[PDB]
Amino acid sequence: GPNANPIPEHFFAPYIDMSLSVHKPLVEYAKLTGTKYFTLAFILYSSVYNGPAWAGSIPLEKFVDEVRELREIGGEVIIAFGGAVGPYLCQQASTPEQLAEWYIKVIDTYNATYLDFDIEAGIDADKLADALLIVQRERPWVKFSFTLPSDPGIGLAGGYGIIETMAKKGVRVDRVNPMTMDYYWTPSNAENAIKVAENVFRQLKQIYPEKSDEEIWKMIGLTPMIGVNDDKSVFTLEDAQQLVDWAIQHKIGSLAFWSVDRDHPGPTGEVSPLHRGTNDPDWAFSHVFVKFMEAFGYTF
Amino acid sequence: GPNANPIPEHFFAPYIDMSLSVHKPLVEYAKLTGTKYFTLAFILYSSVYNGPAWAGSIPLEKFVDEVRELREIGGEVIIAFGGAVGPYLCQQASTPEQLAEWYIKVIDTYNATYLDFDIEAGIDADKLADALLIVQRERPWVKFSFTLPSDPGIGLAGGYGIIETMAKKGVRVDRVNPMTMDYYWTPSNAENAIKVAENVFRQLKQIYPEKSDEEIWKMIGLTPMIGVNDDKSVFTLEDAQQLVDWAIQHKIGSLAFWSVDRDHPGPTGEVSPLHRGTNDPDWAFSHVFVKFMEAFGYTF
Numbered sequence: 004g005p006n007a008n009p010i011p012e013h014f015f016a017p018y019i020d021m022s023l024s025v026h027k028p029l030v031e032y033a034k035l036t037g038t039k040y041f042t043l044a045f046i047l048y049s050s051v052y053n054g055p056a057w058a059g060s061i062p063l064e065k066f067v068d069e070v071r072e073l074r075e076i077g078g079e080v081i082i083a084f085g086g087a088v089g090p091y092l093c094q095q096a097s098t099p100e101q102l103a104e105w106y107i108k109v110i111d112t113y114n115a116t117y118l119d120f121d122i123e124a125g126i127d128a129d130k131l132a133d134a135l136l137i138v139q140r141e142r143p144w145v146k147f148s149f150t151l152p153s154d155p156g157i158g159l160a161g162g163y164g165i166i167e168t169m170a171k172k173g174v175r176v177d178r179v180n181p182m183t184m185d186y187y188w189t190p191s192n193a194e195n196a197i198k199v200a201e202n203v204f205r206q207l208k209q210i211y212p213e214k215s216d217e218e219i220w221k222m223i224g225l226t227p228m229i230g231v232n233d234d235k236s237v238f239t240l241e242d243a244q245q246l247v248d249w250a251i252q253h254k255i256g257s258l259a260f261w262s263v264d265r266d267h268p269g270p271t272g273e274v275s276p277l278h279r280g281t282n283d284p285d286w287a288f289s290h291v292f293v294k295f296m297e298a299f300g301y302t303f
Numbered sequence: 304g305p306n307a308n309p310i311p312e313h314f315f316a317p318y319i320d321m322s323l324s325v326h327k328p329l330v331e332y333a334k335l336t337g338t339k340y341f342t343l344a345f346i347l348y349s350s351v352y353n354g355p356a357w358a359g360s361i362p363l364e365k366f367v368d369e370v371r372e373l374r375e376i377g378g379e380v381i382i383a384f385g386g387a388v389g390p391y392l393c394q395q396a397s398t399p400e401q402l403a404e405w406y407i408k409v410i411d412t413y414n415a416t417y418l419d420f421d422i423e424a425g426i427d428a429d430k431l432a433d434a435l436l437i438v439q440r441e442r443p444w445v446k447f448s449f450t451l452p453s454d455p456g457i458g459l460a461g462g463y464g465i466i467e468t469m470a471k472k473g474v475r476v477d478r479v480n481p482m483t484m485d486y487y488w489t490p491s492n493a494e495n496a497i498k499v500a501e502n503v504f505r506q507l508k509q510i511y512p513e514k515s516d517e518e519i520w521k522m523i524g525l526t527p528m529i530g531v532n533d534d535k536s537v538f539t540l541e542d543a544q545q546l547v548d549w550a551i552q553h554k555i556g557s558l559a560f561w562s563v564d565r566d567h568p569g570p571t572g573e574v575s576p577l578h579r580g581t582n583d584p585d586w587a588f589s590h591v592f593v594k595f596m597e598a599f600g601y602t603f
Contacts, residue, residue: 024347024359024390050324051361059324061360088575090324 006071006114008079013254013299015292016040016081018226018262020276021066022058025264029066029073029080032263036289038296039078039303042119042259043070045086046109048095055092055109064112081148082109085121093126099133106138110145119148119180128165132172139175146177150226153181155195158202170210178256179207180224190236193245196225200255217254224257225250229265229288230279231272240283243291251298258295260288306414308379313556313599315592316340316381318526319563320576321366322358329366329373329380332563336589338596339378339603342419342559343370345386346409348395355384355392355409363412370413381448382409385421393426399433406438410445419448419480425461428468435474446477450526453481455495458502470510478556479503480524490536493545496527500555517554524557525550529565529588530579531572540583543591551598558595560588 010016019032019041033039043066049056055063070080084106085091096102109115120131135147149169151162159166159181169176181203183196200223207219214222225246227238250258262276266288269278279288293301310316319332319341333339343366349356355363370380384406385391396402409415420431435447449469451462459466459481469476481503483496500523507519514522525546527538550558562576566588569578579588593601 024388048324050326051365056324060322060358088577 006074007116008074008077010040010079010081010117011296011299011301012256013296014040014257015259015296016042016257017260017289017292018042018044018083020044020262020264022061023264023276025277029069029078030076033073033076033078033303035286036263036266037286037293037303038289039073039076040080041073041078041263042081042083044083044262045121046082046084046092047086048090048092055105059090063109067112070113079116080113081117081119082113082115083119083121083150084109085123087123089124091122091124091126093131093134094124096130096134099130099137102130102134103137103141106134107141110138110142116144117146117148117177119150119178121150122162122165123152125161126165128168131165132168132174135169135174136172147175148178148180148224149176150180150182153183153199153203154186155189155198155202158199158206163206166207167210176222178224179203179222180226180257180259182226182228182261184226184228184238184261185233187234191227191232191234191238192236193242193249196227196242196246197249200225200253220253221256223255224259225255226259226261228261230281230283231274233274235272237272237281239281240287240291243288247291247295250295258292260292263289306374307416308374308377310340310379310381310417311596311599311601313554313596314340315558315596316342317560317563317589317592318342318344318383320344322361323564323576325564325577329369329378330376333373333376333378333603335586336563336566337586337593337603338589339373339376340380341373341378341563342381342383344383344562345421346382346384346392347386347388348390348392355405359390363409367413379416380413381417381419382413382415383419383421383450384409385423387423389424391422391424391426393431393434394424396430396434399430399437402430402434403437403441406434407441410438410442416444417446417448417477419450419478421450422462422465423452426465428465429472431465432468432472432474435469436472439475447475448478448480448524449476450480450482453483453499453503454486455489455498455502458499458506463506466507467510476522478524479507479522480526480557480559482526482528482561484526484528484538484561485533486536487534491527491532491534491538492536493538493542493549496525496542496546497549500525500553520553521556523555524559525555526559526561528561530581530583531574533574535572535574537581539581540587540591543588547591547595550595558592560592563589
């Protein structure tokens with residue numbers, strides 16, 4: 004389209020924490036990472052603007068021009084809400100109507116075609132669903148992604164109930180993206196990310212028994228935390244390669260990771276938003292993950 | 304005064320992250336915490352305003368009314384620069400003159416009487432000193448505080464060189480406030496905070512051998528991170544009480560902590576800017592720290 008581009012059937016759209024002072028133009032990240040698709044994070048409720056804002060305090064429209072520039076090279080974005088810390092719009096909104104109004108304001112400001120709801124806190128799934136029914140009715144071309152905590156012994160946790168609710172309510176679920184990270188009792192590696200994927204596959208088959216295996220895998224995305232995780236375990240470059248090859252083989256819908264600005268080497272084991280605590284060269288993980296898209300036609 | 308109130312000789316002014324969406328009016332925090340003095344954090348460089356701004360994006364003048372309201376109940380504030388993330392004004396400034404101009408703009412906007420330079424990254428100390436020589440000349444009634452990383456085996460780390468530089472160049476040093484937190488190799492408790500204080504005492508005596516022990520202690524302030532620290536150790540309520548009693552006994556200049564919005568119970572062991580990961584009731588730490596100030600005349 005004139006102001007929106009197509010996202011590949013099998014895509015890699017890593018997370019960019021838009022609030023960081025080190026933030027580079029999206030077109031520059033495209034050149035450095037090799038991918039021209041990104042998940043912009045995170046939109047939260049701002050008391051100052053009494054509405055959506057980045058990190059709950061930065062002007063919503065701040066990155067409109069950056070997105071325009073990215074689209075000029077064929078890139079596209081997914082706008083993410085939520086994250087590890089609130090206040091979420093869905094928590095602050097008093098009614099589903101108000102919540103929908105806020106989501107639609109974000110969609111319209113960025114001519115968004117894909118939204119990601121990163122839910123890591125307790126929320127009113129019924130209110131969220133009612134809001135999304137309004138959103139999909141008013142903006143029928145916008146896809147919905149749900150990024151949720153996961154564990155290799157169970158797949159999705161409380162997030163499973165959120166998807167169950169969406170399905171029952173009739174809310175579109177284009178992508179279910181478990182965060183294959185921070186399990187604490189077992190390491191964040193490829194083996195465990197794959198176990199999570201298999202468990203989530205089973206969970207989605209229970210919600211959508213009429214879907215084929217291929218349709219279920221297409222709904223699934225996986226998002227690891229590169230390098231050192233919050234629990235001190237490390238998702239290595241080897242883990243990245245193993246997961247990418249598994250993802251290609253199973254033809255899943257997408258991959259992403261936390262985060263673009265962390266794809267730099269740094270002091271061993273140090274947790275930071277600016278590097279990953281490993282010694283791999285700048286953009287090393289980005290280049291491995293891009294291989295997932297390249298297997299399915301992508302070239303940049 | 305007509306436009307500013309006195310800050311106690313021995314005070315407790317905890318940090319408030321002004322950029323948080325949860326931000327309540329300063330007068331409300333005063334009622335809840337028991338202290339009417341706060342350190343407002345953090346002023347950084349903003350490319351949009353090409354000068355000082357909160358969190359590097361929020362308009363500088365945004366909280367002028369809140370400060371005026373706090374002053375109506377006898378309260379006062381310390382304006383903090385820097386913090387864990389940049390860009391710092393002292394890093395962006397092209398000259399000491401421009402840097403001084405920015406600091407003075409902040410002083411004049413808030414009729415500030417106390418500034419805190421929270422330096423957690425490498426900086427040009429000589430340049431900062433040249434800038435502060437200008438500031439103290441033009442605004443001789445403004446006190447200077449330096450908040451720096453610390454470790455129980457050494458006292459101040461690289462930040463010690465900053466204080467040495469200030470002293471050598473003739474810049475006033477009213478407060479040296481080590482951040483008694485995140486040591487990683489040993490826990491963030493009262494015992495280690497005290498060891499840090501003793502080492503800082505030695506460090507300041509080495510710079511100012513002519514000052515009495517009482518004068519040195521008055522220059523010192525201690526700032527722990529309440530509850531769970533970034534390295535996962537925990538500064539408990541018991542640690543808070545032990546530190547407060549030690550501080551009263553040694554008649555040090557001040558206490559503060561990170562942070563006001565974290566003084567709430569929350570999931571055990573979780574690091575967040577909205578709670579402290581311990582089970583103590585709301586405002587429990589604030590109430591303990593206030594005892595330090597009460598010992599020297601404070602009543603609210």
